[PDB]
Amino acid sequence: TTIAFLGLGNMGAPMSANLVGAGHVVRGFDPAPTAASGAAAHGVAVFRSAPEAVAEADVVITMLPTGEVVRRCYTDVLAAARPATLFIDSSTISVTDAREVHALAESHGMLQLDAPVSGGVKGAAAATLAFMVGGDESTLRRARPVLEPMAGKIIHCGAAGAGQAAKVCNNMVLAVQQIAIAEAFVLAEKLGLSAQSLFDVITGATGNCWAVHTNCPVPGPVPTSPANNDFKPGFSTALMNKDLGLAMDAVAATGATAPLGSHAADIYAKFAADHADLDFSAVIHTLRAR
Amino acid sequence: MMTTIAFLGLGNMGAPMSANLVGAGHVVRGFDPAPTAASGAAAHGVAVFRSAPEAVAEADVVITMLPTGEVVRRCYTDVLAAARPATLFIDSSTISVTDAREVHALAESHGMLQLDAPVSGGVKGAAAATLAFMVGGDESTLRRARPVLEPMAGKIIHCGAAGAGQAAKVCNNMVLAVQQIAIAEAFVLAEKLGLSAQSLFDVITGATGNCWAVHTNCPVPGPVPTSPANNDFKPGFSTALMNKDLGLAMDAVAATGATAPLGSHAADIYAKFAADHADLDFSAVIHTLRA
Numbered sequence: 001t002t003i004a005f006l007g008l009g010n011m012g013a014p015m016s017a018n019l020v021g022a023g024h025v026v027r028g029f030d031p032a033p034t035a036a037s038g039a040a041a042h043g044v045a046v047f048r049s050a051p052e053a054v055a056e057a058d059v060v061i062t063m064l065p066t067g068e069v070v071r072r073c074y075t076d077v078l079a080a081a082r083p084a085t086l087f088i089d090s091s092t093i094s095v096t097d098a099r100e101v102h103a104l105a106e107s108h109g110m111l112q113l114d115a116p117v118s119g120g121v122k123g124a125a126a127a128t129l130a131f132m133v134g135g136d137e138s139t140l141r142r143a144r145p146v147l148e149p150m151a152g153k154i155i156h157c158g159a160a161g162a163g164q165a166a167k168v169c170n171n172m173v174l175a176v177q178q179i180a181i182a183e184a185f186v187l188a189e190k191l192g193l194s195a196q197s198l199f200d201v202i203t204g205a206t207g208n209c210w211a212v213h214t215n216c217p218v219p220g221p222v223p224t225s226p227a228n229n230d231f232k233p234g235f236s237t238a239l240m241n242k243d244l245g246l247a248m249d250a251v252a253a254t255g256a257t258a259p260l261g262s263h264a265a266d267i268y269a270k271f272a273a274d275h276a277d278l279d280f281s282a283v284i285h286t287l288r289a290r
Numbered sequence: 291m292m293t294t295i296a297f298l299g300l301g302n303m304g305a306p307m308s309a310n311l312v313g314a315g316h317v318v319r320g321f322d323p324a325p326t327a328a329s330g331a332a333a334h335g336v337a338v339f340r341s342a343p344e345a346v347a348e349a350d351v352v353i354t355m356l357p358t359g360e361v362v363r364r365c366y367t368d369v370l371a372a373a374r375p376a377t378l379f380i381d382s383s384t385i386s387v388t389d390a391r392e393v394h395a396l397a398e399s400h401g402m403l404q405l406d407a408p409v410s411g412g413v414k415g416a417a418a419a420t421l422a423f424m425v426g427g428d429e430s431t432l433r434r435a436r437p438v439l440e441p442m443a444g445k446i447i448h449c450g451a452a453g454a455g456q457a458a459k460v461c462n463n464m465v466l467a468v469q470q471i472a473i474a475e476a477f478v479l480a481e482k483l484g485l486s487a488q489s490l491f492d493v494i495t496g497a498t499g500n501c502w503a504v505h506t507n508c509p510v511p512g513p514v515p516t517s518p519a520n521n522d523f524k525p526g527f528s529t530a531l532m533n534k535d536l537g538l539a540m541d542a543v544a545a546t547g548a549t550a551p552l553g554s555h556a557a558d559i560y561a562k563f564a565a566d567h568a569d570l571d572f573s574a575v576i577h578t579l580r581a
């Protein structure tokens with residue numbers, strides 16, 4: 001299989017190197033020369049423009065920063081692709097944007113999936129990413145051997161846009177949970193309940209969740225958690241803030257009532273003005289700001 | 291070992307609790323101001339008394355299971371001078387941290403050992419003897435108490451000094467309330483986005499967002515056939531009781547000056563929902579997000 005990989009950033013570059021390593025011919029494009037060079041060093045043939053990269057591809061993967069860039073990339077390459085090329089957008093963009101680009105691609109006789117990922121750069125490099133896929137089951141079947149070498153998990157979430165929707169919904173819950181856990185540790189401390197005691201209880205009770213059992217925002221109970229390493233990401237506040245912005249778009253587009261997710265979004269937006277580079281669990285230290 | 295236990299408060303939780311102590315071979319002396327409660331407890335082998343002071347007069351251990359801090363405080367004032375010196379008092383009521391510490395000091399000033407040991411698991415846990423006891427107090431007092439707690443308990447966890455049981459419970463349940471609302475918001479958002487409830491369930495449960503409020507308490511019918519959503523939101527854990535816990539959490543926030551934005555927002559949401567839906571499982575809050 002020949003794959004065109006459009007977007008060779010911090011996620012795209014390690015993903016594309018895993019495809020090289022699984023025996024695919026990978027053609028690439030990125031507007032940053034350093035990204036492009038790095039990718040060429042691990043075997044991607046890099047082209048000066050995206051339509052050139054796409055020209056001989058059986059599969060086109062995009063990993064790009066916004067829906068607007070993804071849409072422009074599609075309109076800039078679709079005429080250059082061969083018929084029934086499989087497009088896979090692994091960017092995290094709105095559900096609306098995803099559905100729009102899916103329909104665009106399919107009106108060209110392409111096959112298209114949304115397949116955004118969780119796991120970050122670390123997962124990208126380790127080939128453990130979780131792909132949450134929207135689109136046709138038979139198209140996912142076709143894509144599977146491409147996704148496998150990048151992936152620890154591949155979940156079909158439903159029709160086009162369901163992958164984006166599933167990720168944004170999970171991440172909105174996660175943000176709420178990370179703040180809630182932080183509130184609980186600070187309350188405990190003021191009540192004279194040790195961090196280890198609270199951790200032992202919550203993890204054995206109804207309140208347990210990854211935000212505590214793995215991302216514990218106080219040092220000690222989980223030695224590997226960011227709190228023990230100066231809140232080095234992990235999962236940055238910048239990225240969490242980005243996902244919550246997409247959750248707020250989805251809430252506005254649907255008229256949904258999401259009082260705690262929206263509150264969480266306000267909290268992280270504000271925290272990202274100061275500490276975008278720290279793991280999102282570091283929110284525990286911004287609660288006195290309100 | 292077999293012990294004489296006074297059991298003050300024989301309601302929905304105290305009655306099945308006391309029954310299990312009778313089954314384990316303890317002599318249980320009970321009192322409750324509602325004779326209907328006391329009658330049901332008697333039927334299962336509790337010796338019921340005319341007054342709380344009479345029940346405690348010959349007891350090695352005194353357990354309270356009462357509705358509020360005020361009632362616990364009033365009960366201690368009434369009974370502590372009646373009990374034998376160095377009797378072990380265990381309060382398994384859910385009450386404020388401040389109140390717990392006040393009644394603990396009161397008990398000790400009367401010569402009595404005292405633990406806070408609130409429980410989770412509800413009436414079903416109580417009947418099956420699978421309650422979790424979250425204990426505050428001295429380690430040696432808990433050592434003394436273990437053989438009395440075991441026949442009621444699936445888990446006993448020592449949380450720290452007096453008040454720490456109440457503190458650990460109230461912190462967990464505040465978190466639970468926030469998660470239950472947030473899960474509800476994700477499912478209604480999914481619906482509006484055209485993502486199926488089953489698909490969202492599969493995702494979140496396999497991802498970082500997984501928690502009891504979804505895996506066990508899923509607020510949409512279908513994915514978890516045993517959750518309250520499939521049984522007309524019959525409790526389960528009633529809104530009334532979660533509202534009570536959140537009130538205690540807000541008491542703890544107010545007493546410490548803590549900032550708990552989401553916990554306090556969750557308290558506001560549950561206070562409003564409780565006005566009309568006190569009797570529904572607290573997962574039923576999902577109804578407030580659909581127009």
Ligand SMILES: C[C@@H](CCC(=O)O)C(=O)O
Binds near residue numbers: 147149153
């Ligand atoms: C195991 C995984 C794909 C292959 C891999 O480990 O890369 C999956 O089945 O989702």
Ligand SMILES: C[C@@H](CCC(=O)O)C(=O)O
Binds near residue numbers: 420439440442443
């Ligand atoms: C609580 C005690 C056993 C009692 C029971 O399983 O009813 C234990 O597991 O610590």
